[PDB]
Each structure stands twice: as structure tokens, then as C-alpha cells.
């Protein structure tokens, strides 16, 4: 413990972890060497020992919960969860949004999602302190009920308190940066940033060139949308090689300006003009968009329960309790038992006691705290049902619900993947020229593939006209003349 008193002293002294290694009280052990050591789990066990197990130990663990990697440490009580459940959380936690570094207002990152009101979790693991996760939170403490309420929330969806999303719950800002270069590029062809005009250029998609500034690129604060052309680049090209005037009009230069095909709405945040590594006049322009949590956006607790927001109700229709503290999320009770994610349930009860006591809660996995009964006991001292439930009234008809609903805080994450980006439809789009069949991605506004496997299914349906429609008349229909005397098309 005298070494500990020097470590407390470090607050105003040069003593450090290196000094600690210099006392020779800690050692570094690689995996090959770790095979030959006799390693006690915890000081406690190495102490009690007499004839309990053995006495030949040579090393001891500085703390057993250290076996976890960076993302696994966010997840509280990971040992009360079924093991693969922890693995899904490690993926999803990495997937959530929030604030990702503080100086983000001047970074031109290609794509970012920033949350409005991130909160540090009420329940935490001690490791989370070393992640500065108190500085850059990824989500919000919801008041949650595990109920069935309206059946909207079956099969991993969730009912949400719409007034809570209105009072600003889980709102986000979204940023996309579009970037463009003025290459000198060709032999005599040349690029210029400038406002195009239908009098003297080739191209002129029906989209509106009128929002462009006289500089050739839009300006901050102007509202943009799905067809707006944000930067006006032009390419003087033909030059004059087609003899004569070649003037009529629109003959001097082709259009290739850069326009919205990914951020189908927003505001211009910033427009930034500089010159890049090549020395060309170069541009980056950022658009901020705001995503309200809506039916289809995807969320998760920290114990690998992702689910979609299945509907949203007014704060009037949510079920309510005593004071009328109506829950922001209701996650369906059928979700817990088959996945056995019991740790999520401890977090409500730990969460209820921390918030209520006012002290932030410990949920570091391996301790002697016997943490289930004792958390329950604290909660009863505060005055709730000692094991968490509450009597919630039916929000519609004001009636009391026959049984009780389990409710309390839990950190929740709004994940990157949000409905408004995925939605897609095609009704005769562009056609690729190697196949004269429809495009592939949404980046080229494409159709979907009616795969080998989907085909096989229609045979089993015996709907041949529809199979014939889809693999032919709906995508790529063509007429050919063939000679009769010889089967060759020519």
C-alpha cells in the first residue's frame, strides 16, 4: 500500500507507472510465457488460501474485467448476458452516433451524424472512465417499460413517446461534404468554376441552376434539396475543331457540374474554397441536415437489443404512473426470455437506484457486491416496489393495467443506419450500356435484382407470365431479325 500512497502523490509528484515497474512489483508477460505461470485471479483468493487449492502462485491479475477489448467495456454487467449477446453489442456500440470529437465543427469529414443532447450513461463500468466516454457520450438515458401495450412493438420494434422526440429527444444533425476540383487537366480543354447558362453551354439538365452564385458555387444558409445543383463547374472542350462557326449556341463548353444525389434535403452549412495539393482552385461544401427519430429508425440498448421504432405515440397515450412519468421507449417483453439478456434488466434496477439516489452506478462485471439482491434492497428503501415494477395506468381509457410493468432508466443508442437513407424505388430509370438492363445501385438510381433464387421460386409458383414479365418485359426487351435459311441473326 505504500506504493499506492506514491500513486496518490502523483497529483503533484513525478512518481509514475514506470516507477511502479521499477519497483519490480509488476511484470510483463507474453502469451508463450503465460503458459508457465501460476496465476491467481484476485488478491482475495491468494489471501484466504491455506489448503483451499494451491500456494505456488507467481503472478496476479491487476483486474479480471481487463480481459475485455475497447467496445466490450461499454456494455455494463456483460457477465449477466448470454455470450453472443455481448458480441452483437460490440458491433452496434461501434455503430451508434453521438459526438465523435470535439473539434468537429471545422472538420470536413465526408459524412457525419452528431447527436443533440448526448448524456453520460447512468450505469457505468469503471473502464469507461479510461475511454473518455464521459467526455464524448454516444446516446441517451431513456425511461423504459417492457410492456406489450399496443402490439405495435412485437418482434423487435419499439413504441416511442412522440412528445419526447419533440421536446428534442435523440435529435441529430447530419453532415455531408461534397468536394470538387478545377483541373487544368487537358491539352486545351479547361475547367472553370462558374455559373452556367442555357445560352452558352452543353448539358443543362432540367434541374435548377438558379441557386448557384455568380462565383459558380452556392452560399451558406440557402436551403437546398433533391434536384439542386450546388457547384457550377464547366468544361470548355470542343474548342472549335468542327470547322466553321459551330456557334449556333451552347457550343463553347459542356456541363458537368456537381449536384445533389445523396442528401435529398438540407441547408448549406459551409462553403469552403482553397487550393489543394495539386495547386488547382479547389472546393469543399458542407450540408447540415436534421434527422428526427421516426418509424423506421433503428436503436439499441447496450446489451445487444436492436429494434426498429415501430410507431410513435403522443405523451397523452403512453401509459403513465403515479406522478405520470410516461416511458420514452417500450421494448417488447417477448424480446428478453429467448435471448436471455438478463443484464439489461439489472441495468434498469441499477439505473433506477442511481438516478433516484443521485449517484452514478457501478456495473463493472467482476465484484463481490452480490449486486442483484442489494440493488433491490436499496430501491425499496427509496419507496418503489423493491424489485422494480410499477403500477402503470392505461393511457387511452385511463384504466389501470391488470398487472405491473417494469420501468426505469437505460442508456439507448440511435444507430447510424436510418430509414430515410435506405428507401428506394425505381420506375424506368437509366440503362447501363454493356447490358441495356437497369442500373445497380441507388447511386445511379437503379432497380433490384430478381435473382437466380427468386426466379426458382416463381417456377414453384407456376406463374410463368409473371416470370416472363420480370426476366424480360419489365427490364430489357429487344426485337431482332434473324434469317430463316440460316439461324444467324446477321
Amino acid at each position: 500500500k505504500r506504493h499506492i500512497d506514491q500513486l496518490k502523490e502523483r497529483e503533484y509528484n513525478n512518481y509514475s507507472w514506470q516507477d511502479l515497474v521499477a519497483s519490480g512489483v509488476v511484470e510483463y508477460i507474453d502469451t508463450l510465457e503465460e503458459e508457465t505461470v501460476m496465476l491467481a485471479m484476485t488478491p482475495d483468493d491468494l489471501q484466504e488460501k491455506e489448503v483451499a487449492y494451491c500456494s505456488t502462485y507467481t503472478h496476479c491479475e491487476i483486474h479480471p474485467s481487463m480481459i475485455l477489448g475497447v467496445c466490450a467495456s461499454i456494455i455494463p454487467f456483460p457477465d449477466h448476458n448470454q455470450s453472443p449477446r455481448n458480441t452483437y453489442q460490440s458491433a452496434m456500440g461501434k455503430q451508434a452516433m453521438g459526438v465523435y470529437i470535439t473539434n468537429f465543427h471545422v472538420r470536413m469529414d465526408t459524412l457525419a451524424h452528431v447527436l443533440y443532447y448526448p448524456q453520460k450513461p447512468l450505469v457505468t463500468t469503471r473502464s469507461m472512465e479510461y475511454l473518455r466516454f464521459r467526455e464524448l457520450p454516444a446516446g441517451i438515458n431513456s425511461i423504459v417499460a417492457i410492456a406489450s401495450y399496443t402490439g405495435y412493438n412485437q418482434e423487435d420494434s419499439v413504441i416511442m413517446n412522440r412528445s419526447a422526440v419533440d421536446r428534442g429527444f435523440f435529435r441529430s444533425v447530419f453532415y455531408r461534404s461534397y468536394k470538387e476540383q478545377e483541373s487544368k487537366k487537358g491539352f486545351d480543354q479547361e475547367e472553370v468554376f462558374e455559373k452556367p447558362t442555357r445560352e452558352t453551354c452543353q448539358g443543362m439538365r432540367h434541374a435548377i441552376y438558379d441557386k448557384l452564385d455568380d462565383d459558380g458555387l452556392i452560399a451558406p444558409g440557402v436551403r437546398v434539396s433533391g434536384d439542386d445543383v450546388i457547384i457550377g463547374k464547366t468544361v470548355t472542350l470542343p474548342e472549335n475543331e468542327d470547322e466553321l462557326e459551330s456557334t449556333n449556341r451552347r457550343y463553347t463548353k459542356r456541363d458537368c457540374s456537381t449536384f445533389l444525389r445523396t442528401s435529398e434535403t438540407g441547408i448549406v452549412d459551409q462553403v469552403m474554397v482553397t487550393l489543394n495539393q495539386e495547386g488547382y482552385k479547389f472546393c469543399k461544401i458542407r450540408v447540415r441536415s436534421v434527422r428526427i427519430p421516426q418509424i423506421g429508425d433503428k436503436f439499441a440498448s447496450r446489451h445487444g437489443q436492436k429494434g426498429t421504432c415501430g410507431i410513435q405515440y403522443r405523451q397523452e397515450d403512453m401509459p403513465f404512473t403515479c406522478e405520470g412519468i410516461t416511458p420514452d421507449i417500450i421494448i417488447n417483453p417477448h424480446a428478453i426470455p429467448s435471448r436471455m439478456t438478463i443484464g439489461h434488466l439489472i441495468e434498469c434496477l441499477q439505473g433506477k437506484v442511481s438516478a433516484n439516489k443521485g449517484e452514478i452506478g457501478d456495473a463493472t462485471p467482476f465484484n463481490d457486491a452480490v449486486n442483484v439482491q442489494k440493488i433491490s434492497n436499496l430501491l425499496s428503501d427509496y419507496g418503489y416496489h423493491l424489485r422494480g415494477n410499477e403500477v402503470l395506468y392505461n393511457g387511452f381509457t385511463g384504466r389501470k393495467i391488470t398487472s405491473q410493468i417494469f420501468i426505469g432508466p437505460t442508456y439507448y443508442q440511435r444507430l447510424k443506419h436510418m430509414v430515410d437513407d435506405k428507401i428506394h424505388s425505381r420506375a424506368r430509370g437509366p440503362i447501363q450500356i454493356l447490358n441495356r438492363q437497369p442500373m445497380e445501385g441507388r447511386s445511379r438510381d437503379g432497380g433490384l435484382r430478381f435473382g437466380e433464387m427468386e426466379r426458382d421460386c416463381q417456377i414453384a409458383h407456376g406463374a410463368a407470365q409473371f416470370l416472363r414479365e420480370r426476366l424480360f418485359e419489365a427490364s430489357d426487351p429487344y426485337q431482332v431479325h434473324v434469317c430463316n435459311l440460316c439461324g444467324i441473326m446477321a
Partner: protein, 117 residues
């Protein structure tokens, strides 16, 4: 985006009407009232005032789909008494109870209290 403007939740549409009445043919003497742009706040109360009435055989309401502001009320009465009159009376009766509640409340506030305004 596809989300309605939030005011469209309660303003009547210019080509719509507030209530609509259609007969049911499955059983004699019965009616179906359509209340547009209304919710459980209204629907649930009218159900309870009608069930209070002893001439009413059946009364119930159902909101056909949550995303869709509209409620339907089925009411059925004895042949000797039109179901429409029970509904009109049930509202007026309800209007009377709330009016008496408002008068008693203001008077109760008027009771020796201070800082009432």
C-alpha cells in the same frame, strides 16, 4: 420524407365533414357514426355516456387505424327509441355534467383560498 404535417392531425379537410351516419343491415335498428379528425379523448367519453343510458342495447367505438384520425361508434337501441336521439342526448347530458363541474370548480376555488388568480 413522408411524414404528414402535424397540424393535419386535427384540422378538418376542406372536402370532408365532421360526422357521417350509415345504417347497419346485419341487425334491425342500429347505426354507425363516423367521427373524423377525433381521437380517444372524444371517442372514449361518448362511449361511457351512452352506456349509462338504459335504453341503449350496445355501444362501442373503435379507432380503425392508429395513423388515421377517425373513430367509429356503433350504437344499437330498442325499436321504441331512435339511436340518433340517444347520441344527441348523450352529448347534451355530458355537456351538462361538465358545465356543472366547471361551476363547482370555480366556486370551490372561490372558497376561502388566496392567490387564486
Amino acid at each position: 420524407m413522408n411524414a404528414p404535417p402535424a397540424f393535419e392531425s386535427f384540422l378538418l379537410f376542406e372536402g370532408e365533414k365532421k360526422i357521417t351516419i350509415n345504417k347497419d343491415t346485419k341487425v334491425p335498428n342500429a347505426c354507425l357514426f363516423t367521427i373524423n379528425k377525433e381521437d380517444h379523448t372524444l371517442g372514449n367519453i361518448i362511449k361511457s355516456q351512452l352506456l349509462k343510458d338504459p335504453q341503449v342495447l350496445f355501444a362501442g367505438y373503435k379507432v380503425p387505424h392508429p395513423l388515421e384520425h377517425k373513430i367509429i361508434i356503433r350504437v344499437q337501441t330498442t325499436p321504441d327509441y331512435s339511436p340518433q336521439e340517444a347520441f344527441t342526448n348523450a352529448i347534451t347530458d355530458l355537456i351538462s355534467e361538465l358545465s356543472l363541474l366547471e361551476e363547482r370548480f370555480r366556486v370551490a376555488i372561490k372558497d376561502k383560498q388566496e392567490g387564486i388568480e
